[model samples]
Target: GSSGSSGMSVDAVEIETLRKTVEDYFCFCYGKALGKSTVVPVPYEKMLRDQSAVVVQGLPEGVAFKHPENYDLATLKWILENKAGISFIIKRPFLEPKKHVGGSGPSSG
Candidate 1:
């Protein structure tokens, strides 16, 4: 007996995957951040410091790595994963979840 699979036209992704991508993206930006020429904060310049070029808007005018708090990966992941430990990442929740599987009930069915 062939139980035909439902024709659901959609796809999904995971936060861990999102996390890896985010990590890679940050490292890229971190590397590109200015002042790599020497182990000193640039005499000038957040994301602006976090960028090789003049990028980002409304970013704080200071070296991100200098703060160390913003650059620390463990702290980053902690805030990213937990809410109460949040100094904040974004003002809004970074993750938007949907009850995709077994979602036929308690929703528009």
Candidate 2:
């Protein structure tokens, strides 16, 4: 049941539970999967001025997020759910913070 080395074990049940946990986090209120049905080219200026936090968050994980896409999302979900015990940003699109900085102001429309 326990891997005995890493905090996480390789047990099938544990792995499945973790994966499901990540999935649940991905589906949480602000999870992108539930929020953004499509991928749109992110506007540069808007993202810069308003979405600075997203930019800030990206500065560290930018390469990872860009390359693996869903991998980064899953990683983020794991960190938030497993490490931080959080899910989504609570009823907002994951990028809404960026939209806010760009003066979009919480409009999913």
Candidate 3:
């Protein structure tokens, strides 16, 4: 005559709590992280936890952080091509291409 709540996974409850707490998220991560290795840093970048789609996949694949900051160039090109709106605002800062080498530009015709 008693109900049990032991077998069911409490992901929905856990996922909601992390909705605002973490900086990044991943699907099937909690299991993978523990299964692979209980390391300190974990595998995923940023928050590194299993979260709801609101946080877990808010940025879409290959377009999330590019590592929390900076222009990876790898993802930058992809973003520009896919989402022109963001590129418009960011191009001003990223168009320089003067970060890797900051001396001046070549003066050849």
Candidate 4:
């Protein structure tokens, strides 16, 4: 496992799972919101299936990908929100708006 400034650590497999999930979700939701049928990039989709065999067993309802070295959760969250053509507050795990560490804001990606 690798740790980041955010105190979050995950193995390569976990990272890939989170990565693919984010990308896949983004592609799906973004396309759907835009009235287009889309697909996850071929490479990512193939890799995602392979990794799921050992890392994740099924799709997650909601995933928070926040690791300073990899992806920026706050930025991604805002992008996803905008791309989905919707508006709503994003809370971390079970925290409320103020309690959530990362909300829509300027951040690294």
* Best candidate (score: lDDT): 4
Give TM-scores for every candidate, taking all chains together and pairing residue i with residue i: 0.23, 0.28, 0.20, 0.29
- What Cα-based lDDT does every candidate model obtain? 0.36, 0.39, 0.34, 0.40
Give me the runs in candidate 3 sitting further than 4 Å from their true place.
1-47, 53-71, 84-109
- Candidate 2 residue 66 Cα shift, in angstroms, is 9.7
Better of 3 and 4 by lDDT: 4
lDDT of 2 at 10: 52
| Per-residue C-alpha lDDT of model 1 across residues 49-69, encoded as one tens digit per residue | 434333322223342323223
lDDT of 2 by residue, 1-22 (tens): 6676555545655545555454
Backbone collisions counted per model: 0, 3, 1, 0
Error of 3 at 29 (Å): 23
Find the 10 residues in a row with the least total lDDT in model 1.
Answer: 85-94
lDDT of 4 by residue, 59-105 (tens): 22464322212455544444444444432221211212554576666
Better of 1 and 2 by TM-score: 2
- Winner by TM-score between candidate 4 and candidate 3: 4
The 10-residue segment with the lowest total lDDT in model 4: 87-96
Number of the candidate with higher TM-score, 2 or 3: 2
The Cα error of candidate 1 at residue 95, in Å, is: 34
Index of the highest-TM-score prediction: 4
Cα deviation at 63, candidate 2, in Å, is 6.6
Q: Assess candidate 1 and give its TM-score to the true structure.
A: 0.23
Cα error, residue 75 of model 4, in Å, equals 9.3
Model 1, residue 34: distance off in Å is 4.1
